[PDB]
Scaffold this motif. Structure first.
Motif, PDB file in Angstrom:
ATOM      1  N   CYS A   1      17.480  33.314  35.626  1.00 50.06           N
ATOM      2  CA  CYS A   1      17.957  34.693  35.707  1.00 50.06           C
ATOM      3  C   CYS A   1      18.723  34.931  37.002  1.00 50.06           C
ATOM      4  O   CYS A   1      19.834  35.486  36.993  1.00 50.06           O
ATOM      5  CB  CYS A   1      16.785  35.665  35.594  1.00 50.06           C
ATOM      6  N   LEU A   2      18.148  34.514  38.131  1.00 50.76           N
ATOM      7  CA  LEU A   2      18.784  34.768  39.418  1.00 50.76           C
ATOM      8  C   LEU A   2      20.135  34.074  39.509  1.00 50.76           C
ATOM      9  O   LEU A   2      21.134  34.683  39.911  1.00 50.76           O
ATOM     10  CB  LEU A   2      17.866  34.307  40.547  1.00 50.76           C
TER      11      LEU A   2
ATOM     12  N   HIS B   1      22.048  33.015  37.072  1.00 53.45           N
ATOM     13  CA  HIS B   1      22.966  33.616  36.113  1.00 53.45           C
ATOM     14  C   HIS B   1      23.611  34.863  36.695  1.00 53.45           C
ATOM     15  O   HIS B   1      24.838  35.017  36.657  1.00 53.45           O
ATOM     16  CB  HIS B   1      22.209  33.944  34.828  1.00 53.45           C
ATOM     17  N   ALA B   2      22.800  35.764  37.252  1.00 61.74           N
ATOM     18  CA  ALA B   2      23.360  36.983  37.827  1.00 61.74           C
ATOM     19  C   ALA B   2      24.280  36.668  39.002  1.00 61.74           C
ATOM     20  O   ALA B   2      25.380  37.229  39.114  1.00 61.74           O
ATOM     21  CB  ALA B   2      22.240  37.919  38.268  1.00 61.74           C
ATOM     22  N   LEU B   3      23.847  35.766  39.883  1.00 65.37           N
ATOM     23  CA  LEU B   3      24.643  35.428  41.057  1.00 65.37           C
ATOM     24  C   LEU B   3      26.014  34.909  40.650  1.00 65.37           C
ATOM     25  O   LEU B   3      27.049  35.368  41.154  1.00 65.37           O
ATOM     26  CB  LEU B   3      23.896  34.386  41.889  1.00 65.37           C
TER      27      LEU B   3
ATOM     28  N   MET C   1      12.750  32.408  36.406  1.00 66.78           N
ATOM     29  CA  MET C   1      13.259  33.144  37.555  1.00 66.78           C
ATOM     30  C   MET C   1      14.543  32.515  38.072  1.00 66.78           C
ATOM     31  O   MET C   1      15.518  33.219  38.368  1.00 66.78           O
ATOM     32  CB  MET C   1      12.206  33.182  38.661  1.00 66.78           C
TER      33      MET C   1
ATOM     34  N   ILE D   1      17.603  34.049  47.691  1.00 67.58           N
ATOM     35  CA  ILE D   1      17.261  33.366  46.447  1.00 67.58           C
ATOM     36  C   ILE D   1      16.923  31.907  46.718  1.00 67.58           C
ATOM     37  O   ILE D   1      15.950  31.365  46.175  1.00 67.58           O
ATOM     38  CB  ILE D   1      18.416  33.498  45.440  1.00 67.58           C
TER      39      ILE D   1
END
Ligand SMILES: CCCCCCCCCCCCCCCCCC(=O)OC[C@H](COP(=O)([O-])OCC(O)COP(=O)([O-])OC[C@@H](COC(=O)CCCCCCCCCCCCCCCCC)OC(=O)CCCCCCCCCCCCCCCCC)OC(=O)CCCCCCCCCCCCCCCCC
Ligand SMILES: CCCCCCCCCCCCCCCCCC(=O)OC[C@H](COP(=O)([O-])OCC(O)COP(=O)([O-])OC[C@@H](COC(=O)CCCCCCCCCCCCCCCCC)OC(=O)CCCCCCCCCCCCCCCCC)OC(=O)CCCCCCCCCCCCCCCCC
Ligand SMILES: CCCCCCCCCCCCCCCCCC(=O)OC[C@H](COP(=O)([O-])OCC(O)COP(=O)([O-])OC[C@@H](COC(=O)CCCCCCCCCCCCCCCCC)OC(=O)CCCCCCCCCCCCCCCCC)OC(=O)CCCCCCCCCCCCCCCCC
Ligand SMILES: CCCCCCCCCCCCCCCCCC(=O)OC[C@H](COP(=O)([O-])OCC(O)COP(=O)([O-])OC[C@@H](COC(=O)CCCCCCCCCCCCCCCCC)OC(=O)CCCCCCCCCCCCCCCCC)OC(=O)CCCCCCCCCCCCCCCCC
Ligand SMILES: CCCCCCCCCCCCCCCCCC(=O)OC[C@H](COP(=O)([O-])OCC(O)COP(=O)([O-])OC[C@@H](COC(=O)CCCCCCCCCCCCCCCCC)OC(=O)CCCCCCCCCCCCCCCCC)OC(=O)CCCCCCCCCCCCCCCCC
Ligand SMILES: C[C@@H]1CC[C@@]2(OC1)O[C@H]1C[C@H]3[C@@H]4CC=C5C[C@@H](OCCC(CO[C@H]6O[C@H](CO)[C@@H](O[C@H]7O[C@H](CO)[C@@H](O)[C@H](O)[C@H]7O)[C@H](O)[C@H]6O)CO[C@H]6O[C@H](CO)[C@@H](O[C@H]7O[C@H](CO)[C@@H](O)[C@H](O)[C@H]7O)[C@H](O)[C@H]6O)CC[C@]5(C)[C@H]4CC[C@]3(C)[C@H]1[C@@H]2C
Ligand SMILES: CCCCCCCCCCCCO[C@@H]1O[C@H](CO)[C@@H](O[C@H]2O[C@H](CO)[C@@H](O)[C@H](O)[C@H]2O)[C@H](O)[C@H]1O
Lengths: 53, 57, 87, 383, 106
Positions: E53-54, E56-58, E50, E24
């Motif tokens: 989102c990335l 946030h998920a991480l 992008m 990432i």
């Protein structure tokens, strides 16, 4: 005990994140391609055949 | 050699615009449907209470 | 800058055409002659108005080259002939 | 696929064994069809048996109605098995192509021989019985898949363009279904999201109103011979019969869960006959099962409840979307560093081009200001 | 309380959290020059979306696992008022447990 409980979900989340990354990479590739096409267009060295290809 | 090529050339801009909008729509959906999930775990006070009861106190 | 042509316009003014929304508008309020972004687009007024884009030397931040995996699609078929080959 | 000498030799060698196998399959398929037709005539609805007429509202031309002229025999498993139905479908395809070839032969006498040589040099229109080994069958399937790839995108584009140009969806869910229906096979389409498109298109065009050109494209995509096409109610009848058999088999499998017990090759064939699984994709059992389950979900609960499938046009588009591969892109990105109009450099710029560069170049603001000031001064002097 | 331990799920791919974070960072590092400045009420860019989102998920995965970085979790995972309240609830609990353990040891 908690780790055993939160096992399927964490793995699913990791896989979803990997899939999201793989999904986003092509978008950046297309953006770079469009940047290069625009660069050549501004120089007057872009043919419509190249753009369509 | 002349006609179909010209009409394809005329089509190109609108199709490009619509496909760009479609891609934006799909990424917008990607971010829209993301929510932070706050999990709830059994309060340890009840565990302490049960421990006390087991002691016969 | 070179003398090469650009995206064809057909002698049309994009600020009044039926598909004008497909042509980006710049700061000056002149819609581009192409789907690309053009900063120096102009309009000339003969009997009919027509849009013109003059190529110029401009630097654009170039995103680094991606991997071939993420933009190459090997779905070519025997009947397929590319636009360059057709030209 | 293009013709080749190797395929010509293969088909010439296996010509007579292929004919004999085709005759045996003809006898077996006639028996199966006799059973099915007797069952349809005996237990079929009155409208289906009597061939009720459904006319278009504009030109009053009769065509098959999906609701009335198509009937799902829920109790066909008692008389006919799933394998027999698949055999009948395959034989129907082979018999259609053989019948067209035989008609050409009868029409043109002995002058069809060179055209027969062209025919045997390609596996596109030869029967499956002409392949006596696994490799030959694989090549034949590859040719059929190539024809499907060649034909399907035209059908999908026809449908989408006509609808989008003459109509728009009513609500957001219909919009999402319509947009996601025509996505490329590299992405997975959710049948629940896509199903409302069936009702929307029923509001636009039912199977009874399908145009002849779209029908030609569809029949091309289904490996159904189109010459002579003739009236649209002949190949339309062929399509109706094929999909009626497919729906009967699908109901049988769904009710009896046969696909779970179905083996890998048989499952692949079952998906292929539904135009869901190309052989060149080298799909595994997981992917085949996913696609089959998606197809069943798209059919919907109402299919099992009442034997009513969604709109056939939208169903065909959905299934053929798996043959709509992403547009090819070959060549390293470095190729974008070249120039296309170097051959014009020697010509230079003429007076008009120099003027345009001067006026619209980086000095454009200065030139505009000077010109406007001069014009204003001249106008003031004139007044 | 919880329930039966959820059925085992096979990963569709093998990759470590550290490897994903590095990937990432590499992906977002090449677009830094292109990336743009925007206000809260302005519309966002592709790079910004992008990244959001990335990250946030991480950081959601890290929070569930237990690698609580409250600053990063606050920036990247906390978008709603209710979620902010829940973060505040979490912050007090961890500090309270740390103090309790220290004094119980002392
Ligand atoms: C080298 C060979 C050369 C050959 C030359 C001959 C011509 C070509 C041959 C054939 C070529 C192949 C393709 C043909 C077309 C295929 C059409 C098609 O796809 O049909 C599907 C269709 C199947 O679909 P389906 O769902 O089962 O049914 C259709 C639906 O009903 C459809 O539902 P619908 O909703 O559409 O319903 C409407 C439907 C309803 O109709 C039908 O579909 C029913 C079938 C047709 C019935 C036709 C008969 C009607 C009653 C006639 C009464 C005449 C009385 C006269 C009394 C006179 C007393 C003196 O259509 C009509 O209403 C049309 C009616 C016909 C109108 C005719 C008007 C003619 C005007 C004449 C103007 C003036 C002429 C010049 C002057 C002459 C006088 C001086 O097929 C048929 O229905 C029948 C097809 C028949 C094909 C033709 C057979 C040819 C036989 C040739 C024998 C002679 C050979 C001579 C050779 C000479 C030496 C070389
Ligand atoms: C010698 C004189 C020659 C005259 C000149 C001829 C010129 C050439 C024209 C074409 C002639 C026919 C060629 C052979 C075709 C093969 C037989 C056949 O019908 O196959 C079934 C098949 C039926 O197709 P379908 O779409 O499934 O039918 C829908 C029905 O609902 C299907 O109904 P269903 O859903 O209830 O299912 C029934 C199905 C259930 O059955 C099965 O499932 C079992 C399989 C049965 C069919 C097996 C066919 C095998 C074909 C291959 C044969 C081997 C070839 C070997 C080649 C290499 C040899 C070395 O069984 C059938 O297929 C029965 C169909 C109805 C019978 C048609 C035959 C009628 C004519 C024969 C009787 C003539 C009597 C003369 C009396 C004279 C009195 C004076 O036929 C076709 O594929 C249609 C032909 C395609 C080419 C069309 C070309 C244009 C035709 C225009 C004709 C216009 C009138 C004539 C004048 C022309 C002037 C221009
Ligand atoms: C032993 C065997 C077993 C027994 C027999 C069994 C039965 C066998 C028969 C049945 C077989 C059926 C299946 C056949 C499949 C193959 C069909 C085919 O041809 O495929 C294309 C086939 C290649 O197929 P492929 O490579 O596999 O690709 C297939 C793809 O899937 C591409 O597929 P596609 O779908 O894209 O291609 C389709 C394409 C098919 O077409 C083509 O591809 C065109 C083929 C010809 C192209 C020619 C180009 C070269 C021209 C050269 C010119 C001369 C140059 C100079 C020569 C100097 C010599 C000294 O388009 C069409 O389908 C159009 C159909 C048109 C129908 C026309 C109907 C007209 C009706 C008239 C109106 C009537 C209205 C009613 C009136 C009623 C009045 C009462 O073409 C060739 O191989 C070209 C051959 C060229 C030969 C040399 C040039 C001609 C030589 C003439 C010599 C004349 C000598 C005598 C002169 C005398 C002077 C006095
Ligand atoms: C730059 C210059 C270059 C040079 C240019 C040259 C000059 C050209 C100038 C004019 C060009 C335009 C002319 C147009 C005329 C009007 C056409 C029209 O109104 O069409 C309506 C209409 C349009 O057709 P369609 O069915 O809607 O679809 C047409 C698409 O092309 C279907 O496409 P699709 O994609 O849907 O399907 C593809 C595929 C789909 O695949 C299949 O369907 C499977 C395979 C099917 C095989 C064929 C089955 C046939 C079944 C029986 C048909 C009925 C027979 C009737 C009785 C026989 C009458 C003779 O079908 C094929 O691949 C068909 C293969 C056919 C190959 C032959 C093509 C012609 C090449 C030349 C050979 C003949 C040369 C003679 C002159 C020289 C003599 C020395 O035509 C029909 O209804 C078809 C009726 C066919 C009747 C038979 C032919 C009658 C004409 C006389 C034949 C004479 C034979 C002589 C033998 C040798 C004697 C020595
Ligand atoms: C190299 C060149 C060499 C020389 C060449 C010489 C050329 C001569 C020029 C004059 C020819 C004019 C005719 C052109 C025909 C082509 C028209 C066409 O393709 O239009 C596309 C047209 C456009 O369709 P679309 O826009 O895609 O869709 C619109 C609708 O949705 C479509 O939806 P749909 O399909 O449901 O609706 C249509 C259908 C709806 O109706 C039905 O479904 C029901 C069917 C009812 C059939 C009734 C038949 C009645 C027969 C009575 C026979 C009684 C027995 C008598 C026996 C004794 C006497 C012999 O009705 C029909 O289309 C059938 C109408 C009746 C057909 C009659 C048989 C053909 C007669 C041809 C000769 C005419 C006179 C020529 C001389 C004058 C010229 C000015 O599509 C059709 O019309 C499809 C059907 C085509 C069938 C006709 C062609 C069959 C193949 C002929 C085989 C024989 C070959 C002989 C070769 C000779 C070489 C020398
Ligand atoms: C459009 C173009 C036009 C030109 C063309 O291409 C297409 O047209 C094509 C049409 C072609 C003919 C089609 C059919 C035959 C018969 C075959 O025959 C087998 C052997 C025996 C029969 O088995 C022969 O024995 C016979 O037996 C008969 C009894 O059964 C007797 O009665 C008869 O006397 C006796 O000879 C011998 C070949 C030949 C002549 C072909 C030559 C080449 C063409 C002229 C093509 C040619 C290139
Ligand atoms: C050159 C011509 C070539 C033709 C090729 C195709 C031929 C097809 C032949 C099919 C024969 C079917 O045989 C036929 O089936 C029907 C339907 O079951 C039977 O029909 C019977 O049951 C039905 C249904 O209860 C009743 O409506 C009917 O009154 C009664 O007779 C016929 O009694 C039988 O004779």
């Amino acid at each position: 005990t908690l780790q055993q409980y939160r096992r399927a979900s964490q793995d699913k989340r990791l896989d979803d994140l990997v899939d999201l990354l793989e999904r986003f990479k092509p978008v950046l590739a297309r953006e770079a391609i469009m940047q290069r096409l625009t660069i050549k267009h501004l120089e007057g060295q872009l043919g419509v055949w190249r753009y369509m290809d | 050699d002349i006609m179909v090529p010209s009409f394809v050339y005329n089509k190109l801009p609108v199709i490009h615009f619509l496909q760009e909008k479609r891609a934006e729509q799909k990424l917008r959906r990607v971010l829209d449907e993301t929510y932070t999930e706050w999990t709830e775990e059994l309060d340890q006070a009840h565990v302490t209470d049960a421990i006390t009861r087991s002691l016969n106190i | 800058v070179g003398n090469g042509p650009t995206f064809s316009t057909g002698g049309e003014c994009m600020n009044t055409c039926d598909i004008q929304n497909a042509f980006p508008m710049n700061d000056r309020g002149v819609r581009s002659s192409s789907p690309f972004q053009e900063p120096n687009t102009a309009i000339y007024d003969s009997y009919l108005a027509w849009t013109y884009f003059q190529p110029m030397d401009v630097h654009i931040e170039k995103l680094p080259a991606p991997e071939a995996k993420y933009y190459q699609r090997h779905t070519k078929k025997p009947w397929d002939v590319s636009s360059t080959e057709l030209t | 696929m293009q013709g080749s000498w190797s395929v010509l030799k293969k088909n010439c060698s296996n010509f007579f064994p292929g004919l004999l196998a085709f005759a045996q399959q003809t006898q077996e398929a006639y028996g199966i069809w006799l059973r099915i037709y007797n069952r349809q005539q005996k237990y079929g609805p009155t409208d289906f048996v009597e061939q009720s007429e459904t006319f278009s509202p504009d030109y009053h031309k009769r065509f098959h109605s999906q609701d009335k002229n198509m009937w799902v025999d829920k109790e066909l498993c008692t008389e006919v098995s799933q394998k027999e139905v698949a055999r009948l479908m395959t034989y129907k395809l082979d018999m259609w192509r053989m019948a067209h070839c035989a008609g050409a032969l009868l029409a043109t006498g002995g002058y069809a021989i060179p055209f027969g040589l062209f025919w045997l040099a390609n596996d596109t229109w030869v029967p499956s019985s002409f392949n006596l080994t696994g490799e030959e069958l694989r090549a034949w399937r590859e040719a059929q898949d190539l024809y499907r790839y060649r034909s399907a995108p035209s059908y999908l584009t026809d449908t989408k363009w006509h609808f989008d140009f003459h109509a728009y969806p009513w609500n957001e869910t219909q919009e999402r279904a319509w947009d996601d229906l025509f996505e490329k096979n590299d992405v997975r389409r959710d049948p629940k999201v896509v199903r409302p498109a069936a009702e929307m298109y029923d509001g636009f065009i039912k199977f009874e109103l399908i145009r002849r050109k779209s029908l030609r494209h569809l029949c091309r995509s289904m490996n159904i011979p189109t010459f002579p096409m003739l009236a649209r109610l002949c190949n339309g009848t062929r399509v109706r019969d094929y999909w009626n058999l497919a729906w009967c088999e699908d109901y049988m499998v769904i009710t009896q869960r046969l696909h779970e017990s179905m083996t890998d090759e048989e499952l692949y064939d079952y998906a292929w006959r539904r135009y869901l699984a190309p052989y060149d994709k080298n799909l595994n059992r997981e992917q085949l099962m996913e696609r089959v389950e998606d197809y069943f979900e798209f059919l919907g609960p109402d299919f099992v409840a009442h034997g009513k499938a969604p709109n056939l046009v939208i169903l065909t588009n959905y299934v053929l979307g798996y043959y709509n591969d992403p547009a090819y892109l070959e060549g390293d990105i470095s190729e974008l560093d070249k120039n296309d109009y170097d051959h014009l450099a020697s010509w230079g710029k003429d007076a008009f081009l120099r003027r345009l560069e001067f006026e619209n170049g980086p000095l454009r603001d200065q030139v505009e200001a000077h010109t406007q000031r001069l014009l204003a001064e001249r106008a003031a002097i004139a007044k | 309380y919880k329930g039966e331990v959820p059925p085992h799920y096979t990963r569709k791919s093998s990759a470590t959290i550290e490897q994903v974070e590095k990937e990432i960072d590499a992906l977002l590092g090449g677009a830094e020059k292109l990336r743009k400045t925007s206000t809260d009420d302005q519309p966002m860019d592709k790079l910004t979306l992008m990244e959001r989102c990335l990250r946030h998920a991480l950081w959601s995965y890290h929070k569930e696992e237990g690698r609580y970085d409250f600053d990063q979790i606050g920036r990247w995972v906390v978008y709603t008022p209710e979620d902010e309240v829940k973060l505040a609830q979490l912050k007090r609990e961890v500090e309270a447990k740390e103090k309790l353990a220290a004094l119980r040891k002392r």
